[PDB]
Design a binder for this molecule. Structure first.
Ligand SMILES: CCC(=O)N(c1ccccc1)C1CCN(CCc2ccccc2)CC1
Lengths: 211, 213
């Protein structure tokens, strides 16, 4: 019966603020709650607070007071969360969630990306293939912030490709490797390009990998 | 804050098996505990409320149980669409707290890693920093241990692992281990080896090169 639908993804700057919306459709009555939940990429869920549409009662998670402001419009059946004084710690997907009778519903999520004050494009170094399958790749080092995007031979090479999840180095900069396994007989006859895109710095780096 | 501990970060199952995902609360939360499912990209889906009651639309193979401090989500007769991450949550007191999550992954035959080692590129050697990379390719199960031995000396602190999500075609994992040195220290050592122990390896395999081919 109930459909939660949220606002589009936000791309904002440090110190700024955003207001996300969650419209609840399918309710005839106001006797329902909207819960807000935070999920940083590859992390667990964190509860932010809730707002009750009957009387606009509120509860915040204490560590989000001052960060999150919750408001509700009964008239358009829309809940809002405002996030203020944005930092890198705030970049996440924000879900809304609600219950109705025996059912439970979540919105599609709203991704908030807080941009970096200093951006670094990846240094892309070849992982050169020194039993009958060879491994080769590209080391994608010292980029910031997330994300990176790696392709091989402009999309023509996919089987055997592993692009590893980024690891945050001691330098605060991300590093990853993208590798492929190919038949060793092809090393002298097939060219291998890794295509790396890092959009925060408009970096597109296409790197040749030869034995 | 009440801590919801899910001691199992990964669990393996076959289709048809029965699995139990466990959750322990740091304080007494009665039965006010919920369970959620999340697949990559998708929003979380609420499964259980009050420890043992199903939300609307939840199949009967999802049974929750437990009370007080210990809670369990059991999935009987696992289907392919049940492979996901599972979170427990308490709502008995504020703040409401989720657990760390348990990823339910597909069981398969043991597969030993194909091991490869890459020397640093001469390009990067100009950076004053040298990165040696060791790849463990398409292995199972997830558990692996990599050691870096430079001129036979065990390394520590100066290395970082990264592991892929389970493959949706052959159900394997892959792992990369990167050893970061200064070009200074790289040039005053000769043998570079990554040592791989794995359940599919009948004895530990070391892959290595001598600086200078
Ligand atoms: C942090 C989110 C959260 O805690 N919850 C939630 C879950 C999904 C969507 C919105 C909110 C629930 C809060 C209260 N329920 C028990 C009350 C209940 C039970 C069954 C039907 C209706 C009401 C359990 C967890």
């Amino acid at each position: 019966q109930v459909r939660l639908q949220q606002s589009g993804p936000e791309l904002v700057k440090p110190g700024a603020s955003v207001r996300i919306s969650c419209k609840a459709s399918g309710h005839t009555f106001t006797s329902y709650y909207i819960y807000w939940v935070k999920q940083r990429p590859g992390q667990g869920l964190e509860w932010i607070g809730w707002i009750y549409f009957g009387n606009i009662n509120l509860k915040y998670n204490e560590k989000f007071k001052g960060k999150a402001t919750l408001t509700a419009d009964k008239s358009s059946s829309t809940a809002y969360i405002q996030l203020s004084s944005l930092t890198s710690e705030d970049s996440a997907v924000y879900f809304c969630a609600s219950e109705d009778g025996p059912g439970a519903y979540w919105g599609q999520g709203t991704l908030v990306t807080v941009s970096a004050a200093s951006t670094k494009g990846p240094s892309v170094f070849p992982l050169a293939p020194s039993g009958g399958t060879a491994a080769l790749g590209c080391l994608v080092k010292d980029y910031f912030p997330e994300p990176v995007t790696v392709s091989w031979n402009s999309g023509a090479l996919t089987s055997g490709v592993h692009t590893f999840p980024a690891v945050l180095q001691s330098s605060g900069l991300y590093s990853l490797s993208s590798v492929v396994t190919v038949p060793s007989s092809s090393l002298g006859t097939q060219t291998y390009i890794c295509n790396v895109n890092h959009k925060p710095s408009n970096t597109k780096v296409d790197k040749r990998v030869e034995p | 804050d009440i801590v919801m501990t899910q001691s199992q970060k990964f669990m393996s199952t076959s289709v048809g098996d029965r699995v139990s995902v466990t959750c322990k609360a740091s304080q007494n939360v009665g039965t006010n505990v919920a369970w959620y499912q999340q697949k990559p990209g998708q929003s979380p889906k609420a499964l259980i409320y009050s420890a043992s009651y199903r939300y609307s639309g939840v199949p009967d193979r999802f049974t929750g149980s437990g009370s007080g401090t210990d809670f369990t989500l059991t999935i009987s007769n696992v289907q392919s669409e049940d492979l996901a991450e599972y979170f427990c949550q308490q709502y008995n007191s504020y703040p409401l707290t989720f657990g760390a999550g348990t990823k339910l992954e597909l069981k398969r035959t043991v597969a030993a890693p194909s091991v490869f080692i890459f020397p640093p590129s001469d390009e990067q050697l100009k950076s004053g920093t040298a990165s040696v990379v060791c790849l463990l390719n398409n292995f199972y199960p997830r558990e692996a241990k990599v050691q870096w031995k430079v001129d036979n000396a065990l390394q520590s602190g100066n290395s970082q692992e990264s592991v892929t999500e389970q493959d949706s075609k052959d159900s394997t994992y892959s792992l990369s281990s990167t050893l970061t040195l200064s070009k200074a220290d790289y040039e005053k050592h000769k043998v570079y080896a990554c040592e791989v122990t794995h359940q599919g390896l009948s004895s530990p395999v070391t892959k290595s090169f001598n600086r200078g081919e």
